[PDB]
């Protein structure tokens, strides 16, 4: 019932503790996430990144706690009334023992996407994360929830000039994930972090990661 083994890049970023945002382990050191999360409070001190955590207020085992060595918000992130622009964040994570995470069953990095490569709309992708529901489940949802969303397409996006094109939209029927949480579309059949959750989950608008690779490299190196 601890499903992060499926999708174990998922980083539960808390704020020391309330759950702020999901994240995705791109590297042992670096959790990728949405910035719109932290901009509200931009301090590395503030946030604790969990990994291998399946559950919101229960520390599941295998879960690794990490401080954010460095918080990195996109110098260009813009929060529209609606859309978030360059909503890519970045988190160098350190454990309490001063270390990057270690790959587990429960904790892994998600491949970053091929340089500038995007799934066709209609691809299947997954948004992990507890998600904020009205109608009260009983994975309630402490339990980290993967949800298969189908990529829709830009024009498909229904919001006006959002497409940032540096953004993916995806929606399910019905409709889940967590802002900052990943979206993973199986690429080349090997799993990729296709986009960060920016707005949504009326499809979800995902920061297209493939664009931000330069940013990522530039900040993770």
């Amino acid at each position, epitope marked *: *019932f601890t*499903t992060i083994e499926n999708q174990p890049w998922f980083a539960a970023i808390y704020r020391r503790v309330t759950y702020v945002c999901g994240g995705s382990l791109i590297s042992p050191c670096w959790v990728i996430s949405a910035t719109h999360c932290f901009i509200d409070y931009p301090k590395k001190e503030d946030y604790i990144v969990y990994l291998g955590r399946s559950r919101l207020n229960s520390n599941t085992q295998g879960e690794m706690k990490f401080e954010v060595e460095n918080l990195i918000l996109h110098k260009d992130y813009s929060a529209d009334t609606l859309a978030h622009h360059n909503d890519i964040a970045l988190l160098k994570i350190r454990s309490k023992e001063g270390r990057c995470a270690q790959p587990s069953r429960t904790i892994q990095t998600i491949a970053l996407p091929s340089m500038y490569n995007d799934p066709q709309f209609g691809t299947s992708c997954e948004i992990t994360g507890f998600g904020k529901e009205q109608s*009260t489940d009983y994975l309630y949802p402490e*339990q980290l929830k993967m*949800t298969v969303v189908k990529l829709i397409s830009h024009r498909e996006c229904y919001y006006g000039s959002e497409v940032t094109t540096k953004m993916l939209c995806a929606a399910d029927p019905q409709w889940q994930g967590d802002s900052g949480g990943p979206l993973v579309c199986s690429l080349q059949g090997r799993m990729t972090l296709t986009g960060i959750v920016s707005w949504g989950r009326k499809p979800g608008v995902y920061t297209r990661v493939s664009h931000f690779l330069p940013w990522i490299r530039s900040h993770t190196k």
Partner: antibody
Amino acid sequence: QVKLQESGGDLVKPGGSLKLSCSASGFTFSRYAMSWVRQTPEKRLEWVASITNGGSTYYSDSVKGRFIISRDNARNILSLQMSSLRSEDTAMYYCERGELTYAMDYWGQGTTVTVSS
Amino acid sequence: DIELTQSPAIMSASPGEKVTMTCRASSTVSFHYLHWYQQKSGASPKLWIYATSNLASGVPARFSGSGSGTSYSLTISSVETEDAATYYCQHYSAYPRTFGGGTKLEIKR
């Protein structure tokens, strides 16, 4: 321990209309979605319709349009208003707490609905 | 149209047995929303497993929820006689039928 009481399961003429009540006690109605399911004669279980706590409603392609799920959160009653009833709809009508996406934790004992003339 | 085929439609045999019925969707569905209900004969579907591998209160440790994507399974580790029931796949991502035909578990005696 959350009881679920369908009622108004009854005979009704083809094309006719019937409304099942489901009294929700033992848990906080306002919080939960409620879904209706019907298990047929042949026993295939059909999600009829779901209604989010919010009153937002979702219906099985099977009955959408000719069914309206409704909830009084005042009086904790999931209501399934069926109209344009076809022989199809003849079925054990089960009141579920929860809804499709997250499962239905609790099911009403089920009220039966025969749609025939 | 993302069905949930569910084999076997009906399944059998002995208490102490370890039986597993499959939800096989195809066109793959999230596991978190993959649900198993169990209808005892003449009573109503109890929720059995939710999110695939989660046990609704009361459901005994025997049953366990395994699966991901297209293929999900319900496993009684050891069938007791009170397990005689039909077990339904259910998933919101299954159009038009969120439910599977179910597996009748016929406990052998």
